[PDB]
């Protein structure tokens, strides 16, 4: 067993070197065993929320039969950047499935705004589905690209640690969504695009990963949570998110893998 002190010691070189700060939160889900460092202090979402829009959608699509199929037109929108998906699309449109699957996938952000603005009520609409699933922590306070100012020290549009692992676990693991809809919002994550070389890199490549990075831009800031099926062993939830305190600080996918690795070897998976 690996002292806990020893992983928050490694934790704490690693976050010295990078110069700034790195939030953990880990949980067993055979064992419940958890380990967390920063784990209750916030950080900024970026686009990680994403993965959570998904969920909310394949929750309202429990009390609105066919709504998944449903085709959204935007042909005179004003698109946001980073929308690779949603651009391409739009002289036919999107069904909703399609816009969930390319806001997580590809973190495609016109279509987190559309579904947003069209199916979830907006970022208080957001913050209102985390809060039906018992995350008092999760905030979204703004739209996309604004919400990516992670501006030290501010609470709006961010989390912790500990309630972005909490609450992937309750997504992909519990009650909230019905066999069919927890099994399509995992796949959505198992297929995510842009996360190879943040926790993904931290394991064996034959191990089976589902995860949605988030990158500010700015102020160093840029995170990435998953569920991780290793061979022979229960999954584990995990979210690690990173900050620096000067603005044109950029983040390092390197430092989050490595994070990932620290905290894992603290189970006791055979990798
Ligand atoms: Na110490
Ligand atoms: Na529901
Ligand atoms: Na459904
Ligand atoms: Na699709
Ligand atoms: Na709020
Ligand atoms: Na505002
Ligand atoms: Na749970
Ligand atoms: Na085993
Ligand atoms: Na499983
Ligand atoms: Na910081
Ligand atoms: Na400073």
Redesign the pocket.
């Given at each position: 067993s690996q002292p806990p002190?020893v992983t928050?010691?490694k934790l704490?070189r690693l976050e010295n070197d990078f110069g700034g700060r790195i939030g953990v939160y880990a949980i067993d889900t055979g064992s419940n065993k958890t380990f967390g460092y920063r784990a209750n202090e916030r950080f900024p979402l970026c686009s990680s929320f994403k993965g959570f829009l998904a969920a909310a959608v394949l929750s309202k699509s429990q009390q609105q039969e066919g709504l998944l199929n449903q085709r959204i037109r935007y042909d005179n929108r004003v698109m946001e950047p980073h929308s690779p998906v949603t651009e391409k699309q739009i002289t036919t449109g999107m069904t909703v499935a399609e816009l969930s699957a390319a806001t997580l996938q590809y973190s495609d952000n016109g279509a987190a705004n559309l579904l947003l603005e069209k199916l979830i009520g907006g970022p208080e609409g957001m913050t209102s589905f985390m809060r039906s699933i018992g995350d008092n922590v999760f905030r979204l306070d703004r739209w996309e690209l604004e919400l990516n100012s992670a501006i030290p020290g501010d609470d709006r549009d961010t989390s912790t640690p500990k309630a972005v692992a909490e609450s992937m676990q309750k997504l992909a693991f519990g009650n909230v969504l019905g066999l069919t809809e927890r099994h399509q919002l995992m796949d959505w994550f198992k297929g995510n695009t842009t996360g190879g070389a943040r926790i993904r890199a931290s394991v064996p490549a034959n191990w089976v990963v589902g995860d949605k990075t988030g990158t500010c831009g700015v102020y160093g800031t840029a995170n990435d949570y998953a569920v991780i099926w290793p061979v022979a062993h229960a999954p584990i939830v995990l979210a690690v998110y990173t900050s620096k305190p000067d603005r044109n600080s950029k983040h390092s996918d390197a430092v989050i893998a490595d994070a990932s690795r620290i905290v894992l070897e603290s189970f006791n998976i055979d990798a």
């Open positions: 002190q928050v010691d704490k």
